[PDB]
Design an enzyme around this catalytic site. Structure first.
Site, PDB file in Angstrom:
ATOM      1  N   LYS A  43       9.398  30.471   0.006  1.00 56.64           N
ATOM      2  CA  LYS A  43      10.050  30.887   1.231  1.00 56.64           C
ATOM      3  C   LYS A  43       8.999  31.570   2.097  1.00 56.64           C
ATOM      4  CE  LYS A  43      14.277  29.507   0.631  1.00 56.64           C
ATOM      5  NZ  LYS A  43      14.997  28.612   1.595  1.00 56.64           N
ATOM      6  N   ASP A 103       9.414  26.465   2.653  1.00 53.08           N
ATOM      7  CA  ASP A 103      10.673  26.473   3.393  1.00 53.08           C
ATOM      8  C   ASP A 103      10.621  27.641   4.369  1.00 53.08           C
ATOM      9  OD1 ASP A 103      13.206  26.530   4.430  1.00 53.08           O
ATOM     10  OD2 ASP A 103      14.230  26.194   2.515  1.00 53.08           O
ATOM     11  N   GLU A 125       9.893  22.554   4.624  1.00 51.41           N
ATOM     12  CA  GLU A 125      11.305  22.443   4.962  1.00 51.41           C
ATOM     13  C   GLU A 125      11.680  23.234   6.229  1.00 51.41           C
ATOM     14  OE1 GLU A 125      13.627  23.171   1.496  1.00 51.41           O
ATOM     15  OE2 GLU A 125      15.555  23.051   2.552  1.00 51.41           O
ATOM     16  N   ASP A 138      16.747  20.707   6.957  1.00 48.89           N
ATOM     17  CA  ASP A 138      17.790  21.335   6.164  1.00 48.89           C
ATOM     18  C   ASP A 138      18.891  21.756   7.115  1.00 48.89           C
ATOM     19  OD1 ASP A 138      19.467  22.671   4.464  1.00 48.89           O
ATOM     20  OD2 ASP A 138      18.078  24.330   4.052  1.00 48.89           O
ATOM     21  N   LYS A 182      23.321  19.402   0.931  1.00 44.56           N
ATOM     22  CA  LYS A 182      24.037  20.492   0.260  1.00 44.56           C
ATOM     23  C   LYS A 182      25.524  20.176   0.339  1.00 44.56           C
ATOM     24  CE  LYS A 182      20.873  24.339   1.217  1.00 44.56           C
ATOM     25  NZ  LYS A 182      19.959  23.405   1.929  1.00 44.56           N
TER      26      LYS A 182
END
Ligand SMILES: CC(C)C[C@H](N)C(=O)N[C@@H](Cc1ccc(O)cc1)C(=O)O
Ligand SMILES: [Mg+2]
Length: 353
Positions: free
Chosen positions: A161, A189, A215, A240, A264
Site C-alpha cells: 500500500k 496499490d 493498482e 480497482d 470484488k
C-alpha cells in the site's frame, strides 16, 4: 427447491491491527451475515461486508437492505439467480454488499443442492487459489521488516500500500525490495492517491525495482488520467475503484483504460455479477484479480476464492481479509491462518458450517 425464510445478523470483529491505506483506516470487520433456508431444509450462507470509503455502504444500511431483499424472495428457487438479481435491482439502485450477501447464500444453496463444491459449478478450472498478502501503509523500514515476516510465512507475492506522497512511497518500495530481494513479486496499490503525472514519475523511478503492477494510481473518476498512466508505462496497470461492475468494465475495455481489473464481490453485488465482469474482461484480453474488503470474513472470502479457483481468467488473488480477523464467525471455509495457499475442499457449496 424454494426459499422458506431469510435471516440476517450483524457481525462485528476486531482486526489484530489497524490497517492504513491512502483512503483511511480500518480497525473492525463489521459485516452482515445471512442464512437462507429452503423448505426442504438446506441452508445457505452469505455475507455483506461494506467498505465505507469505497462504496459508502454501512452495516446498518446493508442490514436494512438485506431484510428488504429477503422478504421479497420468499418462494423463489435459489437457482433462478437471474430473477433474484432482477428483484433486488428493482428494489435498490445500489447496494452491492447487500446484493452479494443474498447472491452468495444462493450459490451456497445451489452447491448444496447439486452436492458439488461451488468451484465446480462456476467453471471448475482449479480447486484452490494462491493469494498475496497486503502490507498497510507505514514507515519504509517497518514495512520492509513486515515484508520479511510475511515472506517467512511463505508468501511469494506482496501487495504494497502506498499513497502519502511519491517521495515517501518510493522509499517504501525501495526498502521493501532491498529487504526481501528480487525473488518476491511486489504489486503496488495507491488507492487513488497520485496525480497522473506523479504516477508516471513514481513508476519510472521504480523501474529497476521490478514492479509487477500498480493498482488504481489515480482518482476513481479520472479515467482519462488512468489511461494516461497505462499508455505511458510498460508497467502493468490495474483498475480497482474505477471498476465496480460489468458496466464499468465494458467502459474500461472500450477505452483501453487499463491492463488488469480488480474484482470484488462487495463492489459488484455478488458472484453472478462478478462472472459478468470476468467474461467481458477475458473477451477483451484483460486478466482479472479477485480482491476483497477488509470488512469481510470467511463467508465472503471463501465465496471469492471458489469463483477465482473456478475461472481461468482470474489469474491473481488478493484474499487476505481473514488473516487479520480476531475470530471466525462460522466453521469451515478459508481459515484465519495467514498462508498463501487457500485449498478448497470437496464439501458441497462453500463448505461452510
Ligand atoms: C486487509 C486486506 C483485506 C485489504 C485488501 N487486500 C485490500 O487492499 N482491499 C482494498 C482496500 C480496502 C478496502 C476496505 C477496507 O476496509 C480497507 C481497505 C483494495 O484497495 O484492494
Ligand atoms: Mg485496490
Amino acid at each position: 427447491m424454494k426459499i422458506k425464510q431469510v435471516h440476517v445478523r450483524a457481525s462485528k470483529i476486531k482486526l489484530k491491527e489497524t490497517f492504513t491505506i491512502a483512503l483511511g483506516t480500518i480497525e473492525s470487520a463489521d459485516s452482515a451475515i445471512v442464512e437462507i433456508e429452503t423448505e426442504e431444509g438446506l441452508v445457505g450462507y452469505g455475507e455483506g461486508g461494506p467498505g465505507i470509503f469505497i462504496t459508502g455502504e454501512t452495516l446498518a444500511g446493508t442490514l436494512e437492505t438485506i431484510e428488504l431483499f429477503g422478504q421479497a424472495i420468499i418462494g423463489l428457487n435459489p437457482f433462478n439467480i437471474e430473477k433474484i438479481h432482477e428483484v433486488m435491482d428493482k428494489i435498490s439502485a445500489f447496494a452491492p454488499a447487500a446484493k452479494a450477501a443474498i447472491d452468495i447464500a444462493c450459490y451456497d444453496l445451489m452447491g448444496q443442492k447439486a452436492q458439488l463444491p461451488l468451484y465446480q459449478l462456476l467453471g471448475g478450472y482449479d480447486n484452490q487459489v494462491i493469494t498475496d498478502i497486503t502490507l498497510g501503509i507505514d514507515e519504509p523500514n517497518v514495512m520492509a521488516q513486515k515484508a520479511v515476516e510475511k515472506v517467512k510465512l511463505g508468501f511469494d507475492t506482496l501487495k504494497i500500500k502506498v499513497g502519502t506522497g511519491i517521495e515517501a512511497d518510493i522509499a517504501r518500495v525501495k526498502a521493501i525490495r532491498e529487504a526481501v530481494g528480487f525473488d518476491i513479486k511486489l504489486r503496488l496499490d495507491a488507492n487513488q492517491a497520485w496525480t497522473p503525472k506523479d504516477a508516471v514519475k513514481a513508476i519510472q523511478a521504480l523501474a529497476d525495482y521490478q514492479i509487477e503492477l500498480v493498482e488504481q494510481p489515480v482518482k476513481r473518476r479520472d479515467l482519462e488520467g488512468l489511461k494516461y498512466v497505462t499508455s505511458q508505462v510498460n508497467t502493468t496497470i490495474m483498475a480497482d475503484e474505477s471498476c465496480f461492475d460489468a458496466q464499468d468494465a465494458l467502459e474500461l475495455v472500450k477505452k483501453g483504460t487499463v491492463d488488469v481489473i480488480n474484482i470484488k464481490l462487495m463492489k459488484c453485488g455478488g458472484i453472478h455479477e462478478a462472472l459478468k465482469i470476468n467474461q467481458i474482461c477475458e473477451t477483451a484480453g484483460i486478466e482479472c484479480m479477485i480482491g476483497c474488503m477488509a470488512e469481510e470474513t470467511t463467508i465472503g472470502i471463501t465465496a471469492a476464492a471458489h469463483l477465482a479457483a473456478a475461472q481461468k481468467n482470474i489469474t491473481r488473488a488478493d484474499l487476505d481479509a481473514t488473516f487479520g480477523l480476531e475470530t471466525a464467525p462460522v466453521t469451515g471455509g478459508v481459515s484465519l491462518e495467514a498462508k498463501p495457499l487457500l485449498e478448497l475442499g470437496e464439501a458441497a457449496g462453500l463448505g461452510i458450517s
